[PDB]
């Protein structure tokens, strides 16, 4: 059973990439056609002639010519019977306690097809994107694997829908936050239902904005709509009964991009006071903590909740400050945990795109990331560990590899390459860490592969040291147990005595300095050289520019030597 499977995806998004890894690592072939136009979708099917079509992320209706000829299954992010384009938005706005995902056949009527598989799950009070990347994605994987087994068996019949309901596209009027009428729980519900797109509209300091990444505040109080404080570029705003933090906003304009709230509001905030809390402080009320440092059982854990895993220059230096603090503490190990949804996606391309000089801001940002990496590497007397609870891409992968040990949750998707951002050389000391893990020949192959790999595949090729756990919480518990056991063994003390000798030696310090110098000379060429492919790629990415064809790295059926 080696199936030829065509994906129909609006973008090759997180769910599409996860399914690509699950199917190809089971020796199926997956070609992708991006959802650009029905004419191109029909052509892709006739070119590739798939055994099965899966649509992980659909914007347009699939043409009848296609799904009447090829068995075509659609992912719907609601339980059986739920129909409509905004299933998760409604489940969050209505406060559903149970939700689910359905794999159904394409049909003439919208979302009316017979059910191949479904999964249900309890809802969290959390952003839509977090539900999509965790509960929905895990359930969809189980559905698709079940359906492939059923498809190959050959006598399967799907289950017609019985009860069903329709929810239309959700209008912004429903999402709009009114500070005087809305209590904190209502503001959170609206922002969660609209994050990461399209955003919940509001007015803040007279500016029409879209709100993203909200957190409740229990200490600061004021008038509704009043800005109460700034913290790490997030703003705290009074609600009907309390206050909420908004970390990111977008102006309500076609060309504007998502940015830290302080950068969107700008001079309108003049006079607001910063209300800082250090990551290592303890507080007994709910508040916004971008970076959190906690110690348990001789292990110092650093959580860094950078929105979308994107690490701005200033976020990197706040992470650096926390790592330096941890290195002065009486812990045996330091664990970098990222956030539940992302370990890291490297430099923050949005704050780079927004800068007066994107090239200069890129230079600032890569030097700040390398300072984090260098601080991690130069830790002679403590174990360092990267715990990847969620996805990582580009420099975010190589940030993890600077740690002594890298572990990841099952189902994490890695993109250890720069092919989507103009072929940057990369830094983060990859020219030291990567050959140490996989060898030079394999390391070059890894960085030449533009397709994603799972954490299981990363473990199998030696890129990371272990993979375990199904949820972020299970992964964190198992990681803590594994590290606790290690640091309480004689093996740890022998390892640290070796590490102390290696990492204070002149030869090693010269080696990693030469690695940083060489990588940054190449990145300087990427950022400032006459060839501006990096800047063009960043613009297309950050501005979400549309596609007019599917590139052959995705579309096997559009490659030069393709036939049959
Ligand atoms: C890693 C990657 C392939 C994952 O693809 P994916 O699973 O489909 O996830 P998405 O592209 O949808 O990312 C989710 C969100 O994070 C944003 N994002 C991801 N990486 C980002 C980055 N480095 N900077 C700014 N935003 C980033 C995306 O724009 C998207 O934003 P939105 O939901 O608010 O609209 C893709 O996000 C990517 O190429 N990121 C850039 C990594 C990079 O090039 N960094 C700079 C060089 S170090």
Numbering used by the authors: -1 to 562
Report text from the authors:
HypX will catalyze two consecutive reactions, the formyl-group transfer from N10-formyl-THF to CoA and decarbonylation of formyl-CoA, in the N- and C-terminal domains, respectively, to produce CO. The putative catalytic residues, His74, Asp80, and Asp109 in the N-terminal domain and Ty416 and Glu426 in the C-terminal domain, are perfectly conserved among HypX homologs listed in the previous report.
Their crystal structures were determined at a resolution of 1.80 and 2.40 Å for Forms I and II, respectively. The Form I and Form II crystals contain two molecules (chains A and B) and one molecule of HypX in their asymmetric units, respectively. Based on the results of MS analyses and the shape of the electron density, we assumed the molecule bound in the cavity to be CoA, whose molecular weight is 767, and found that it was the case. As we did not add CoA during the purification and crystallization of HypX, it was thought to be bound to HypX in E. coli cells. There are Tyr416 and Glu426 near the SH group of CoA adopting the folded conformation, which are candidates for a general base responsible for decarbonylation of formyl-CoA.
